[PDB]
Amino acid sequence: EVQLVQSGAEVKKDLASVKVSCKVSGYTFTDYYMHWVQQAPGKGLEWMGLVDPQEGETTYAEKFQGRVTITADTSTDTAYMELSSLRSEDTAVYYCAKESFGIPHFWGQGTLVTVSSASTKGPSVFPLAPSSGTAALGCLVKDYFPEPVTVSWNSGALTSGVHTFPAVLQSSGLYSLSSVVTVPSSSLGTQTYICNVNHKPSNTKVDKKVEP
Amino acid sequence: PQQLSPINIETKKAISNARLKPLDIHYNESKPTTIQNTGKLVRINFKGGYISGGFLPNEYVLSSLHIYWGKEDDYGSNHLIDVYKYSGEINLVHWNKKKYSSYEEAKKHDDGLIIISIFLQVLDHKNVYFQKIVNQLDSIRSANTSAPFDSVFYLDNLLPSKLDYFTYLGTTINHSADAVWIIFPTPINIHSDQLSKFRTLLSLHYITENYRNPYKLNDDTEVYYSGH
Amino acid sequence: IVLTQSPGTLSLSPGERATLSCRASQSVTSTYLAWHQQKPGQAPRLLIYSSRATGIPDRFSGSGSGTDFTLTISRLEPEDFAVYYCQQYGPYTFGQGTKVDIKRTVAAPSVFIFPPSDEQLKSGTASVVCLLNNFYPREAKVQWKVDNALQSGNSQESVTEQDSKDSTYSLSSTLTLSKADYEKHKVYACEVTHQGLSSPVTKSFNRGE
Ligand code: NA
Ligand code: NA
Ligand code: NA
Ligand code: NA
Ligand code: NA
Questions:
Q1: CATH number for the domain including C126?
Q2: Is C176 on the interface with A (CB under 8 A)?
Q3: Are strands C149-150 and C155-159 parallel, antiparallel or unpaired?
Q4: How many CB atoms lie within 10 A of CB B160?
Q5: Are C5 and C97 found together in one domain?
Q6: Beta-bridge mates of residue B15
Q7: Residue-number span of the structural domain to which C66 is assigned
Q8: What's the CATH number where B155 sits?
Q9: Second CATH level (architecture) for the domain A114-212
C-alpha cells in the first residue's frame, strides 16, 4: 500500500548544502503530516521537524532550526529536506516518515548523507600474522575513504570462525577496519590464508597472503 | 493593497450588485477523507465537491474545511455581522482548479481561493449532522494528528437554511494568501456540549479559543451583498 | 522534555517475557507516548501509540501514565531482539534507546596481540592491534602499555554486533604510533580486564621478535 522512496546516499564537502528527497506513493500526500528524523551512526533517533504538505507549513526542532529546510511538492508527491551548512557531525542517516496518529507511522529507508573533506582514497592492506590449541590471524585494512569496504577469506571459502569489524574514523579523516579469523594452530604452516579486500569507490580489489 | 481578514460586515454599508447570479453549491459528491488537529484548529479534508455560479469566473473545487471557536459559547466566530459574533465559524476552502496546477499555486493569486463562511450558533438543540464531526474529536485530541474520518457524513447537511451572502476580497485567516470570502449570515445551530469537546483538544495548554480578531475594512475595499 | 529508558541494555532468552520501560521528566500530557522497534541497519517500526498498530502481533502491549510507561512483550521470539525507543508526542523527543541482546552464559575473551607489519613501517606509521574474541557480556576494557607506561588517547576501538550463532561479542583495538615514536620502546602489551575473567589478563610482545 504505502511506500516511501528516499533519495540515494550522498557524500558532501564541508560548508555544502545537500537536498535529500522523499518520493511518496499509495496514500493522499496532503491528508497526513510528514516527519523527518536524524540518526547518527551508532547513536539513537532524534526528531528534526515536520511539515503539513497541504499548506507547506513547517515546524522544526530548535536544535536544528536555521540550518534545515523541509518542503513539500504536491505536484510530484515529493517531500524534501535541505541541510544548510554541512559539518562533520551532520554525518548521519536521514529518515522521511508519514504521520498517522500524531507520530511517524510509516518510515522510509533513510538516506546516508556523509560529510568529509577527505578525497576518495583506496585502502592499504597489511597482515596480522601470529607467532605463538587455536590461533588468530587477520588483515588490517587502512587509510581509505569512503565507506563501505567488503572483506572475505579464501575467495569466500573460509567463512566459519571469522569476524570482520566495523570501521573507525581516524583523525586524518580516513576510515580503518580490521578483519580476523580463529583457526586451529595445527593447520598454521600447511594451510594458506588469503584476505579479499574490495573497495568499490576507487575500483581497488586487493588480495593478501597472510603468513608468519 | 492587501485587505486583512477577518473583518466586521457593516450590513448597511454593503453594496448590492446585479451581476451577482445565485450561488450554486455541489457538495453532493464530496466525501471527507481525514480529520486533523493542526495544533491551532480542527481541519476536515475533502475529496470531491465544488462551487459555481454567482460572481465566480468558473467552478472552484472543495479542498478542505476549518473550524473555529472561542473561550465562551457566546463569542467565538472570526467574522462579525454589525459587531455581533456567533459561537463559532466553519470555513470551507475552495480553489481554482480550472485555472491553476495546484492549490499550492492557487494560493499565490487573488483569483485562486474562495472561502465559504458558515456561522455556528449555540442554542438548546443537538445538531445531528454536526455531531458526526464531534464524534471524531477523540481521534485527533493530540496535536499535529490526522485520522480517518470514521463515519458517514454529507457536508451538504451543514449548509444554512438561507444562502444569501456577503462577499469581499480578503485574505486567508492566517494571512498566507489573498482569498475571496463568501459569508452566509444565517447560521446553523448547535448545542453547547458539542462545542465543548473542541476545547479539550491539545495545542502546539489546550485549544480553548482559536479565532482571529478582526481588522479595519480598507478604504478601497467594498463588501457586496446578494439578495439570494 | 527528557525521557530516559530502563535498563541501559536488557538481556533475556526466547520464550520468556520482556519488560521494557521509559520514564519522563515532565507529565506526558493526556498520556501520549509511543514505542518504536529498530532492528540493525534498518528503518524503525511503530509498535504502539497502549494502542496497537495494525500489522503488530498480539505479543506486544504497552501501558502507563504520567511519567512512567512500560512496554511488555509476553512470550518472546528471536526476531523480537532489537533496539527499542520510546517517543513522547501530542515535542517529539525520543528516548535514548534500549538494546535487547541475548542472555548467554558468562564467557571470556581469547586475547591475541598483533605487531605491525614491515610493509606499513616503510610508510612511516605503525599499527599495533589487540584482538579480544567471543566473550559475554559486551562490557570489556583494554589498556595499552609501552614499557609499562600506561597509554590513553592514542587507542581506537571497534566492536562486532552480537554474533547470531554463539551469542558473543568480539573487539578490535587499534593502537597507532609513528615509526620514530614506535622505534624508541621495547615491551608492547595489551591488558584485558573482563568480568568472566577471574583476574586481569595480559598479552604482549617485544619489538623485533
Ligand atoms: Na515501516
Ligand atoms: Na623468521
Ligand atoms: Na499575479
Ligand atoms: Na502573524
Ligand atoms: Na502577520
A1: 2.60.40.10
A2: yes
A3: unpaired
A4: 15
A5: yes
A6: B224
A7: 1-104
A8: 3.10.200.10
A9: Sandwich (2.60)
For residue A57, give the 3-state DSSP assignment. Answer: strand
Q: How many CA atoms lie within 13 A of C175 on its CB side?
A: 24
Q: How was this structure determined?
A: X-ray
The CA distance from B54 to B66, in Å, is: 23
Q: Domain check: are C115 and C188 in the same one?
A: yes
Nearest alpha-carbon partner for C2 in C35, C33, C25, C32: C25
- C1 and C76, same structural domain? yes
Strand, helix or coil for residue C38: strand
Q: What are phi and psi of C59, to 5 degrees?
A: -50, -50
CB B130, CB B188: distance < 8 Å: yes
* Chain A residues 1-40 with a CB less than 8 Å from chain B: 28, 30-33
Run of H or E residues at C145: strand C140-146
Work out whether the CA dihedral C130, C135, C141, C147 comes out positive or negative: negative
The CA–CA distances, whole Å, from A117 to A67, A92, A146, C8 equal: 19, 16, 11, 35
Residue C190 CA to ligand 2 center (angstroms) comes to 23
Among chain B residues, CA nearest to A101: B145
Q: How far apart are CA B49 and CA B114, in angstroms?
A: 13
Closest residue in chain A to residue B176, using alpha carbons only: A55
Instruction: Tell me if chain A has a CB within 8 Å of the CB of C27.
Output: no
Mutate to test the interface with B, among A27, A54, A101, A103 (most CBs of B within 10 A): A54
CA distance A108 to A101: 17
Alpha carbon C178 to its chain centroid, in Å, reads 30
Structure resolution, Å: 2.9
Count up the domains in chain C and report the number.
2
Interface of C with A in 72-131 (CB under 8 A): 83, 85, 87, 89-90, 92-97, 110, 112, 114, 116-117, 119-120, 123, 127, 129, 131
State how far the Cα of A134 lies from the Cα of C134, in Å rounded to an integer: 13
Candidates B31, B65, B144: best to mutate against A (most CBs of A within 10 A) is: B144
